[PDB]
Write an enzyme that holds these catalytic residues in place. Sequence first.
Site, PDB file in Angstrom:
ATOM      1  N   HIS A   1       0.834  -1.208   0.000  1.00 15.66           N
ATOM      2  CA  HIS A   1       0.000   0.000   0.000  1.00 15.66           C
ATOM      3  C   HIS A   1       0.871   1.262   0.000  1.00 15.66           C
ATOM      4  O   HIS A   1       0.428   2.331  -0.412  1.00 15.66           O
ATOM      5  CB  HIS A   1      -0.908   0.014   1.214  1.00 15.66           C
TER       6      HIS A   1
ATOM      7  N   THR B   1      -5.725   7.030   8.170  1.00 10.68           N
ATOM      8  CA  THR B   1      -6.329   7.261   6.859  1.00 10.68           C
ATOM      9  C   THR B   1      -6.446   6.025   5.965  1.00 10.68           C
ATOM     10  O   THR B   1      -6.773   6.138   4.780  1.00 10.68           O
ATOM     11  CB  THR B   1      -5.619   8.392   6.104  1.00 10.68           C
TER      12      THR B   1
ATOM     13  N   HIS C   1       6.053   7.030   6.360  1.00  8.83           N
ATOM     14  CA  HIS C   1       5.643   6.655   5.012  1.00  8.83           C
ATOM     15  C   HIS C   1       5.092   7.887   4.287  1.00  8.83           C
ATOM     16  O   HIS C   1       4.856   8.942   4.897  1.00  8.83           O
ATOM     17  CB  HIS C   1       4.544   5.602   5.066  1.00  8.83           C
TER      18      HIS C   1
ATOM     19  N   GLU D   1      -3.111  13.848   1.054  1.00 10.65           N
ATOM     20  CA  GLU D   1      -4.378  13.428   1.637  1.00 10.65           C
ATOM     21  C   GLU D   1      -5.096  14.675   2.163  1.00 10.65           C
ATOM     22  O   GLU D   1      -6.262  14.912   1.861  1.00 10.65           O
ATOM     23  CB  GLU D   1      -4.124  12.397   2.743  1.00 10.65           C
TER      24      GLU D   1
ATOM     25  N   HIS E   1       4.110  11.191   6.433  1.00  6.34           N
ATOM     26  CA  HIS E   1       3.494  10.895   7.722  1.00  6.34           C
ATOM     27  C   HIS E   1       4.509  10.253   8.665  1.00  6.34           C
ATOM     28  O   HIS E   1       4.994   9.136   8.407  1.00  6.34           O
ATOM     29  CB  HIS E   1       2.335   9.902   7.558  1.00  6.34           C
TER      30      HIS E   1
ATOM     31  N   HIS F   1       2.370   9.220   0.837  1.00 11.32           N
ATOM     32  CA  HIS F   1       1.159   8.964   0.050  1.00 11.32           C
ATOM     33  C   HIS F   1       1.478   9.871  -1.159  1.00 11.32           C
ATOM     34  O   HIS F   1       2.019  10.973  -0.980  1.00 11.32           O
ATOM     35  CB  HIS F   1      -0.109   9.446   0.787  1.00 11.32           C
TER      36      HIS F   1
HETATM   37  N1  LIG Z   1      -1.574   7.007   6.739  1.00  9.71           N
HETATM   38  S1  LIG Z   1      -1.613   7.061   8.437  1.00  9.71           S
HETATM   39  O1  LIG Z   1      -0.622   7.908   9.090  1.00  9.71           O
HETATM   40  O2  LIG Z   1      -2.952   7.343   9.025  1.00  9.71           O
HETATM   41  C1  LIG Z   1      -1.295   5.464   9.211  1.00  9.71           C
HETATM   42  C2  LIG Z   1      -0.346   5.228  10.212  1.00  9.71           C
HETATM   43  C3  LIG Z   1      -0.186   3.942  10.745  1.00  9.71           C
HETATM   44  C4  LIG Z   1      -0.960   2.868  10.294  1.00  9.71           C
HETATM   45  C5  LIG Z   1      -0.807   1.439  10.848  1.00  9.71           C
HETATM   46  O3  LIG Z   1       0.061   1.271  11.747  1.00  9.71           O
HETATM   47  N2  LIG Z   1      -1.602   0.317  10.382  1.00  9.71           N
HETATM   48  C6  LIG Z   1      -1.503  -0.914  11.129  1.00  9.71           C
HETATM   49  C7  LIG Z   1      -2.492  -1.264  12.047  1.00  9.71           C
HETATM   50  C8  LIG Z   1      -3.062  -2.626  12.045  1.00  9.71           C
HETATM   51  C9  LIG Z   1      -4.078  -2.963  13.010  1.00  9.71           C
HETATM   52  C10 LIG Z   1      -4.531  -1.973  13.971  1.00  9.71           C
HETATM   53  F1  LIG Z   1      -5.496  -2.301  14.888  1.00  9.71           F
HETATM   54  C11 LIG Z   1      -3.958  -0.622  13.960  1.00  9.71           C
HETATM   55  C12 LIG Z   1      -2.935  -0.258  12.994  1.00  9.71           C
HETATM   56  C13 LIG Z   1      -1.914   3.097   9.294  1.00  9.71           C
HETATM   57  C14 LIG Z   1      -2.103   4.359   8.745  1.00  9.71           C
HETATM   58 ZN   LIG Z   2      -0.136   7.772   6.195  1.00  5.26          ZN
END
Ligand SMILES: NS(=O)(=O)c1ccc(C(=O)NCc2ccc(F)cc2)cc1
Ligand SMILES: [Zn+2]
Length: 258
Positions: free
Chosen positions: A62, A196, A92, A104, A117, A94
């Site tokens: 992703h 997000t 990371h 975003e 981010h 986007h």
């Molecule tokens: N683009 S962003 O900054 O919002 C963002 C930051 C971290 C994560 C993440 O750690 N996903 C894993 C994850 C898997 C299971 C969970 F319960 C919680 C997080 C996702 C999005």
């Molecule tokens: Zn992010």
Amino acid sequence: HHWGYGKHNGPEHWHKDFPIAKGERQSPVDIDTHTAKYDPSLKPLSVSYDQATSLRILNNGHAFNVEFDDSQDKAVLKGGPLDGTYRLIQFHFHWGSLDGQGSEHTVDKKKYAAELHLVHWNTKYGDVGKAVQQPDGLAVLGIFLKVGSAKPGLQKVVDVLDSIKTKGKSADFTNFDPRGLLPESLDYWTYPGSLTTPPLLECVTWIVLKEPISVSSEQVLKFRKLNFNGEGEPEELMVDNWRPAQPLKNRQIKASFK
Ligand SMILES: NS(=O)(=O)c1ccc(C(=O)NCc2ccc(F)cc2)cc1
Ligand SMILES: [Zn+2]
Ligand SMILES: NS(=O)(=O)c1ccc(C(=O)NCc2ccc(F)cc2)cc1
Ligand SMILES: [Hg+2]
């Protein structure tokens, strides 16, 4: 069969498996500069990344994540709208298939070429898993990227991308300094939101920097050469991995400057 940014499993379908997608504090949102409130009680941001230990970089299908050693208070975020200490765990981006899209969050409806981010979690909770069960569990530092001149501090990231081209690949990535990715000023807008991407947990205090960083066309081109698919699957370029702005609802965006 798993979420994505395609026509058939993109953001508009996420609500089917993740009901929170239509919640009250979802991100990202459009920042209307004329309606944001100057709150003079907001303190300045405190960024302490001098003892940061990066470890690995990986393509997760992703986006790509650069991971950090968060076993100790090596790289923290304090001050601003925050209460307590937040540890950096990963960062990371986007981005889009074209320079006029990619971010975003938007500013007065304006989209940038990409968005960075830097993800942190509240130390009071013990571990990230616990932090995601709290309203003030996470803090993400958002930075806009616009196309212009090259950013030296980003090249180290750009060079290693060829070894993590496909989903599941990871390369060792030690001694990277995140301070090289910061703009000159630390002025910001802040509001309560969410992750997000699925699972979209509303556990985030968003801190969006006013001043974007500049990156070259060549640098951004290399991000677009990555793949969503795993090795041996048909090729799908990794681009436009961003979710559309969501309704602000009953929220107010506060600025740390006038
Ligand atoms: N683009 S962003 O900054 O919002 C963002 C930051 C971290 C994560 C993440 O750690 N996903 C894993 C994850 C898997 C299971 C969970 F319960 C919680 C997080 C996702 C999005
Ligand atoms: Zn992010
Ligand atoms: N200390 S370390 O470098 O090995 C490390 C680095 C990244 C991650 C990660 O990105 N998962 C986030 C995550 C996982 C579960 C959640 F519930 C929320 C966030 C976990 C550990
Ligand atoms: Hg939460």
